[PDB]
Ligand binder design. Structure first.
Ligand SMILES: N[C@@H](CCC(=O)N[C@@H](CSSC[C@H](NC(=O)CC[C@H](N)C(=O)O)C(=O)NCC(=O)O)C(=O)NCC(=O)O)C(=O)O
Ligand SMILES: N[C@@H](CCC(=O)N[C@@H](CSSC[C@H](NC(=O)CC[C@H](N)C(=O)O)C(=O)NCC(=O)O)C(=O)NCC(=O)O)C(=O)O
Lengths: 286, 284
């Protein structure tokens, strides 16, 4: 018979599949441990998921343009193991999610958390990948906030119910597969008539959406999702993914804090530990 | 059940929203948007997300910024108004709120509540530090709100209040996450008056519309009891402080069944009984 929710919700059962070892109804630190700090002006604490890739790609894009103040240390945070709940991590992101960073480029350090805030902070600092004024700024912000507000349906809904939940729940898989397809259709309809999401040039709105959409579209995210969701239908998404795939900052940034690349980045020469081909073409994750 | 190799749109989904939710985007009717006299044209509904936009504009009017005068036209989301050609042209995602900035020589769209908040805060130089570390703190909390409300509304609200069958695993997932998010805010507000510092900013406004509506018992049936809202005393303090702001008291009523269907001039509020603008009862 049908489940009847209690009057008062209680945390009486594991939830999250593999993530049941970390998912809780309360926030805060579970151990006292300071974060490591390197020599570079930006300190990033992350994992090479689509959200971590936004941050490390952005920094590599800035280095591609010659901005030495974008040099960074990218320290590995293993989210299945609860590294996001150390006191040091909670102090830089009260929400205990990656990516989070400390801007140590000025006289006093300060935290920046949330991938969208990291992208906007870096774009504003260096004056690139985000129009500084005018209608084009509003268009870019609209698409960036769209990405941030919609990825929860893609990863927290579809990815979870399709690939991590311990039981396959038809209503939930249908809900979030449908919504993920709708979001791809929004992008596809836009990219039919515009080279990039917020205009004719690559911006942070593209980078933010690309990490998620490219990983799903090319077949590397959530099991058989690309077949399940009929990714072939989104040919304009495919074109735009292909354009962005070719950018050197994307090729480098995708490899940071990645099981297919570097565990950590502490200097530009660190990439010489990888096969050189990894810097020249997309490497799909496991 | 066993998912098929290829997902097909062959079953209803969405419960109360089953008549509007689709796997495809784009318009379902040809209709132009109405346009009024004021510099900002808002197309919205007084849900927590619409309230962000109309409260922000009312906050700006409280500060005397006449360029924040606005027309707020009603978009009925259960009726598919978000899929007219005119609405899709200002928000390709077909969600409220969306806006047209007609304050300058050429009009342009702004869509997403967070982008609307940032656009207005940057235009008028208020509710968002213009530079310095405090700007980064504000942006962090604003993006946090935008990235987490989907779990509260699209997860918890959906499965607890709108889905046709109660699904234990899904209710647990999103009840747990909603409580975690309230706990993040509660732990912050234990040590800070507002989320991003000592002053009210757009990060507070964005979070407040959602958190206050739930905390006070107004959203999602018995959710406030279900989620033990009493546990979050610092959230309660902050809700009560923001509840008292004159711009909140006005803006929360715009495009609302319990207030004004539409707003086309400041005097529109005079048509309501004066009690409508009076102190919000606590539960904060
Ligand atoms: N808005 C934030 C989001 C940052 C974020 O979610 N970071 C996580 C790693 S990215 S992998 C995709 C992620 N899935 C999970 O986090 C799984 C654990 C989660 N608790 C769950 O049960 O689903 C996802 O779906 N993100 C949605 C989104 O990006 O909007 C992370 O650090 N998780 C740690 C955790 O404890 O949850 C931003 O943009 O920065
Ligand atoms: N990131 C956007 C979100 C704007 C938005 O979602 N606007 C909707 C009205 S606000 S009511 C809360 C909303 N719930 C729904 O939209 C219900 C319908 C939906 N299709 C569903 O099945 O759940 C919600 O949970 N929002 C989550 C969030 O704020 O992140 C809206 O216009 N819905 C119309 C539609 O067709 O979906 C922003 O901040 O602006």
């Amino acid at each position: 018979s049908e489940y009847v929710p209690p009057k008062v919700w209680k945390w009486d059962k594991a939830n999250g599949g593999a993530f049941a070892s970390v998912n809780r109804p309360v926030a805060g630190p579970t151990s006292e441990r300071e974060l490591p700090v390197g020599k570079h002006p930006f300190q990033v604490y992350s994992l090479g998921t689509p959200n971590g890739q936004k941050a490390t790609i952005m920094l590599e894009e800035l280095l591609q343009l010659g901005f030495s103040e974008a040099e960074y240390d990218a320290w590995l945070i293993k989210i299945f193991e609860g590294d996001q709940f150390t006191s040091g991590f909670v102090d830089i992101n009260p929400n205990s999610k990656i990516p989070a960073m400390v801007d140590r480029s000025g006289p006093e350090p300060f935290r920046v958390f949330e991938s969208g805030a990291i992208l906007m902070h870096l774009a504003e600092k260096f004056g690139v990948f985000l129009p500084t004024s005018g209608p084009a700024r509003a268009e870019c912000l609209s698409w960036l906030f769209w990405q941030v507000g919609s990825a929860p349906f893609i990863g927290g809904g579809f990815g979870h119910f399709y690939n991590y939940a311990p039981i396959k729940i038809e209503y939930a898989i249908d809900r979030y597969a449908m919504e993920t397809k709708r979001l791809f259709d929004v992008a596809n309809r836009r990219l039919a008539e515009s080279r990039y999401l917020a205009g004719d040039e690559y911006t942070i709105a593209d980078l933010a959406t690309y990490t998620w959409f490219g990983n799903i579209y090319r077949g590397e995210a959530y099991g058989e999702a690309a077949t399940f969701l009929s990714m072939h239908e989104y040919e304009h998404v495919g074109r735009w993914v292909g354009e962005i795939d070719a950018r050197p900052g994307v090729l480098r940034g995708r490899l940071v804090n990645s099981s297919k690349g570097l565990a950590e980045r502490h200097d530009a020469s660190d990439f010489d530990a990888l096969p050189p081909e990894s810097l020249q073409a997309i490497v799909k994750g496991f």
